[PDB]
Enzyme design. Structure first.
Site, short mmCIF file in Angstrom:
data_model
loop_
_atom_site.label_atom_id
_atom_site.label_comp_id
_atom_site.label_asym_id
_atom_site.label_seq_id
_atom_site.Cartn_x
_atom_site.Cartn_y
_atom_site.Cartn_z
N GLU A 269 0.79 -1.24 0.00
CA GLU A 269 0.00 0.00 0.00
C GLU A 269 0.81 1.28 0.00
O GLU A 269 0.46 2.24 0.70
CB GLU A 269 -0.93 -0.02 1.22
CG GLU A 269 -0.17 0.06 2.55
CD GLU A 269 0.16 -1.27 3.21
OE1 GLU A 269 0.34 -2.27 2.49
OE2 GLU A 269 0.28 -1.28 4.46
N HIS A 293 -8.10 -4.32 -1.06
CA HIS A 293 -7.31 -4.32 0.16
C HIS A 293 -6.29 -3.15 0.16
O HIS A 293 -6.20 -2.43 1.15
CB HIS A 293 -6.57 -5.66 0.31
CG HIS A 293 -5.78 -5.75 1.58
ND1 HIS A 293 -6.33 -6.31 2.73
CD2 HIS A 293 -4.51 -5.38 1.84
CE1 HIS A 293 -5.37 -6.26 3.64
NE2 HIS A 293 -4.26 -5.70 3.15
N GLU A 294 -5.51 -2.98 -0.93
CA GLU A 294 -4.50 -1.90 -0.97
C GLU A 294 -5.15 -0.51 -0.93
O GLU A 294 -4.64 0.39 -0.24
CB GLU A 294 -3.57 -2.06 -2.19
CG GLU A 294 -2.75 -3.34 -2.20
CD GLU A 294 -2.20 -3.84 -0.88
OE1 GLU A 294 -1.58 -3.04 -0.14
OE2 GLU A 294 -2.40 -5.04 -0.57
N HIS A 297 -6.11 0.45 2.63
CA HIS A 297 -4.96 0.90 3.44
C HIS A 297 -4.73 2.42 3.37
O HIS A 297 -4.09 2.97 4.26
CB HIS A 297 -3.68 0.18 3.00
CG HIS A 297 -3.38 -1.11 3.71
ND1 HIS A 297 -3.27 -1.17 5.08
CD2 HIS A 297 -3.06 -2.31 3.19
CE1 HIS A 297 -2.91 -2.41 5.36
NE2 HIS A 297 -2.75 -3.12 4.26
N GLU A 316 -3.89 -4.30 9.58
CA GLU A 316 -4.45 -5.36 8.75
C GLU A 316 -5.90 -5.73 8.95
O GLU A 316 -6.58 -5.94 7.96
CB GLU A 316 -3.54 -6.59 8.72
CG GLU A 316 -2.19 -6.30 8.10
CD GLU A 316 -2.13 -5.62 6.74
OE1 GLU A 316 -3.07 -5.77 5.92
OE2 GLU A 316 -1.11 -4.94 6.48
N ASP A 373 9.66 -10.09 9.79
CA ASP A 373 9.50 -10.93 8.58
C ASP A 373 9.23 -12.41 8.91
O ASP A 373 8.53 -13.07 8.17
CB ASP A 373 10.72 -10.82 7.65
CG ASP A 373 10.82 -9.47 6.97
OD1 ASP A 373 9.77 -8.82 6.78
OD2 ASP A 373 11.94 -9.08 6.60
N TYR A 381 -4.36 -10.37 9.94
CA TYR A 381 -5.41 -10.09 8.96
C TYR A 381 -6.71 -10.75 9.38
O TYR A 381 -7.74 -10.09 9.44
CB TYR A 381 -5.05 -10.70 7.58
CG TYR A 381 -3.85 -10.09 6.91
CD1 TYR A 381 -2.56 -10.43 7.29
CD2 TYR A 381 -4.00 -9.26 5.81
CE1 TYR A 381 -1.45 -9.88 6.67
CE2 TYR A 381 -2.90 -8.72 5.15
CZ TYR A 381 -1.62 -9.02 5.59
OH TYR A 381 -0.52 -8.50 4.98
O1 LIG Z 1 -0.89 -5.65 1.91
C1 LIG Z 1 -0.10 -6.26 2.75
O2 LIG Z 1 -0.35 -6.34 4.00
C2 LIG Z 1 1.26 -6.85 2.28
C3 LIG Z 1 2.36 -5.74 2.37
C4 LIG Z 1 3.82 -6.26 2.61
N1 LIG Z 1 3.90 -6.83 3.97
C5 LIG Z 1 5.24 -7.01 4.62
C6 LIG Z 1 5.34 -7.14 6.16
C7 LIG Z 1 6.41 -7.83 6.73
C8 LIG Z 1 6.53 -7.95 8.11
C9 LIG Z 1 5.56 -7.42 8.94
O3 LIG Z 1 5.70 -7.53 10.30
C10 LIG Z 1 4.84 -8.01 11.16
N2 LIG Z 1 4.27 -9.12 11.08
C11 LIG Z 1 3.45 -9.41 12.10
C12 LIG Z 1 2.67 -10.53 12.29
C13 LIG Z 1 1.89 -10.58 13.45
C14 LIG Z 1 1.88 -9.54 14.36
C15 LIG Z 1 2.66 -8.42 14.15
C16 LIG Z 1 3.42 -8.39 13.02
S1 LIG Z 1 4.48 -7.08 12.58
C17 LIG Z 1 4.52 -6.74 8.40
C18 LIG Z 1 4.41 -6.60 7.02
C19 LIG Z 1 2.63 -7.45 4.37
C20 LIG Z 1 1.81 -8.00 3.17
ZN LIG Z 2 -2.23 -5.29 4.08
#
Ligand SMILES: O=C(O)C1CCN(Cc2ccc(Oc3nc4ccccc4s3)cc2)CC1
Ligand SMILES: [Zn+2]
Ligand SMILES: [Yb+3]
Ligand SMILES: [Yb+3]
Length: 608
Positions: A269, A293-294, A297, A316, A373, A381
């Site tokens: 997004e 979705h995007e 955001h 999310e 990551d 989500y």
């Molecule tokens: O449109 C979209 O959402 C896409 C956009 C790209 N992107 C990359 C990303 C990577 C690492 C992240 O970190 C975290 N993951 C978690 C899991 C659980 C709780 C807290 C956290 S904080 C968050 C996002 C996400 C997919």
């Molecule tokens: Zn997202």
């Protein structure tokens, strides 16, 4: 509160207000070089030093008031990178602002970037570069307070070889030949709305555009322009619904960039310029919910931001909630429920994968010493969506809940918030229903692992046929296989065909003879749709069909969307017949993969 993923001075000490980026892209060295001029505001009396986040950056000098200043890079703290402490020449009083100009160079191995050779592009004549900052990769491009708790505006001037085009998460502000090198062009950008730095984005490549709406251009290499314009033609109609649900679109432009196949996510997004995977190019607009979705955001995540990555569900969960309302407005309420129930299924899958007691299945996570990551999954989500959908039902329905959604966006626009700020506002807005809100098991919903304590109510209309066909296949014995025929799928949409596969995949493996019969009658091998194809190949590999091995390997490597690549590599490593091939294929492709994807597939395959 504390952002445990950042090594920089917190927002209570100082805040970056603006970034003026001046950089040059060098494809030969695979480096981005330039100056990041940070306008920093002190939040304390007698401020004499500050700390910035960096990761694999080479710092040349730091300039304040036209003079070079002292700086020190601390020891690297794994995925967090290295803290950069800067000695201010003059002590600052509270609210005083200064401009700090940092001369830097990125590493070719920057975790934020993917450098592509011409062979890895559609055109085969020009190289390509793209960024991906979310969650904490902006520090691998430039020195910053790499935390969503700080919001800044930005301006940028990017020098690139003249035959290429640069785009950013900002409004295009012109182009000129580089006055320092006539073999190059300078592209200018302006982002006047304050953003967290993970929303900073850059792409450099042989890009062409086509207009598809009054405030939308689709960008891609020439080969994908025509297909992309068609696939994303509903964009403007979705933007109009989203404005009705969340209030004014404040970003000016809403452009789309269709990246090369190694783009690791479905969508990102980035403000003014959403990045999308080419795996959405199904040919029938069936994967357009990623655009919805995007678009969502632009309100939930970009306007109202999570204060730290521990509260990522706020971004999310509310976005999935808004996305499903957009698709509900376009296709009907029965479709919204179908998508919502599909989402519950994806949550069941994530919880089963990690285990019901796993800390990453908690809605609010503690990311202290965790790489975001590695923690990333469907949990924020789907568990996030499930909570809001449950609250919607508890509080009187979608019309009432959408009123809260709109007030929440208005209240927290341009701010970074926590779960407590959201809960507090929820209680305030719904003050006449506090008796109802006090019945929610908050401790379980927000802080407990596993499936939520309550499952919402879902209309089954569109799901019924998927469940019925999946159950026919699962309960079938050898003598029942003859009764299956291509006619079984005549009344199923592509979404229902995907849900049929998802339901069957949850009961995998099925006998090898059943999977062979499914290909014989349904010819699933011919389906190009990336979501259907991915679930079909997982079903084949988990049911031990050797013929699926080259098809699964080809899909896992010809595209790099993690949602598909990771489970395909994992399934191929778990099948004895393909284990050695999966490991070898990863080893051969590792050097040309996206650095985050390469790291994660390595961990999943236990290959160092
Ligand atoms: O449109 C979209 O959402 C896409 C956009 C790209 N992107 C990359 C990303 C990577 C690492 C992240 O970190 C975290 N993951 C978690 C899991 C659980 C709780 C807290 C956290 S904080 C968050 C996002 C996400 C997919
Ligand atoms: Zn997202
Ligand atoms: Yb201008
Ligand atoms: Yb029988």
């Amino acid at each position: 509160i504390v952002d445990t993923c950042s090594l920089a001075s917190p927002a209570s000490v100082c805040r970056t207000k603006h970034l003026h980026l001046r950089c040059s892209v060098d494809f030969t060295r695979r480096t981005l070089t330039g100056t990041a001029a940070l306008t920093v505001q002190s939040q304390e009396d007698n401020l004499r030093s500050l700390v910035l986040d960096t990761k694999d950056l080479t710092i040349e000098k730091v300039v304040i008031n036209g003079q070079e200043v002292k700086y020190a890079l601390g020891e690297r703290q794994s995925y967090k990178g290295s803290p950069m402490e800067i000695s201010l020449p003059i002590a600052l009083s509270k609210n005083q602002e200064i401009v700090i100009e940092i001369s830097f160079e990125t590493s070719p191995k920057s975790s934020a970037l993917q450098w592509l050779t011409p062979e890895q592009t559609s055109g085969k004549e020009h190289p390509y570069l793209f960024s991906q900052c979310q969650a904490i990769h902006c520090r691998a491009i430039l020195p910053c307070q790499d935390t969503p708790s700080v919001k800044l505006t930005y301006t940028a001037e990017v020098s690139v070889p003249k035959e290429l085009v640069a785009l950013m998460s900002a409004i295009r502000d012109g182009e000129t030949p580089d006055p320092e090198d006539p073999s190059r062009k300078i592209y200018k950008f302006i982002q006047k709305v304050p953003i967290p730095c993970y929303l900073i984005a850059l792409v450099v490549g042989a890009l062409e555009s086509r207009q598809i709406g009054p405030r939308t251009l689709v960008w891609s290499e020439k080969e994908q322009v025509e297909k992309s314009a068609y696939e994303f033609s509903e964009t403007e109609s979705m933007l109009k619904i989203a404005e009705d649900l969340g209030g004014p679109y404040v970003w000016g432009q809403y452009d789309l960039l269709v990246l090369p196949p190694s783009f690791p996510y479905g969508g990102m997004e980035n403000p003014c310029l959403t990045f999308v995977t080419p795996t959405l190019l199904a040919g029938d607009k069936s994967l357009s919910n990623v655009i919805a979705h995007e678009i969502s955001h632009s309100w939930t995540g970009n306007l109202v931001t999570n204060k730290t990555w521990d509260h990522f569900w706020l971004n999310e969960g509310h976005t999935v909630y808004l996305e499903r309302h957009i698709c509900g407005r376009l296709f009907g309420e029965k479709f919204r429920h179908f998508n919502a129930l599909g989402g519950w299924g994806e949550l069941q899958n994530s919880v089963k994968t990690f285990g019901e007691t796993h800390p990453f299945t908690k809605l609010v996570v503690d990311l202290t010493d965790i790489d975001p990551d590695v923690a990333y999954s469907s949990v924020p989500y789907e568990k996030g969506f499930a909570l809001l959908f449950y609250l919607e039902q508890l509080l009187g329905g979608p019309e009432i809940f959408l009123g809260f959604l709109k007030a929440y966006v208005e209240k927290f626009s341009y701010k970074s918030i926590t779960t407590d700020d959201w809960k507090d506002f929820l209680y305030s807005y719904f003050k006449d229903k506090v008796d109802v809100l006090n019945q929610v098991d908050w401790n379980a919903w927000l802080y407990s692992p596993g499936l939520p304590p309550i499952k919402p109510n879902y209309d089954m209309t569109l799901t019924n046929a998927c469940i019925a066909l999946s159950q026919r296949w699962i309960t079938a014995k050898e003598d029942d296989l003859n009764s299956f025929n291509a006619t079984d799928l005549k009344d199923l949409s592509s979404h229902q065909l995907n849900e049929f596969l998802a339901q069957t995949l949850q009961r995998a493996p099925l006998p090898l003879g059943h999977i062979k019969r499914m290909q014989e009658v349904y010819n699933f091998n011919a389906i190009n749709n990336s979501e259907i194809r991915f679930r079909w190949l997982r079903l084949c590999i988990q049911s031990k069909w050797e013929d699926a091995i080259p098809l699964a390997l080809k899909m896992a490597t010809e595209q790099g969307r993690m949602k598909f690549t990771r489970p395909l590599f994992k399934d191929l490593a778990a099948f004895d017949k393909s284990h050695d091939q999966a490991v070898r294929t990863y080893q051969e492709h590792k050097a040309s993969m996206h650095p985050v994807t390469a790291m994660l597939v390595g961990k999943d395959l236990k290959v160092d």
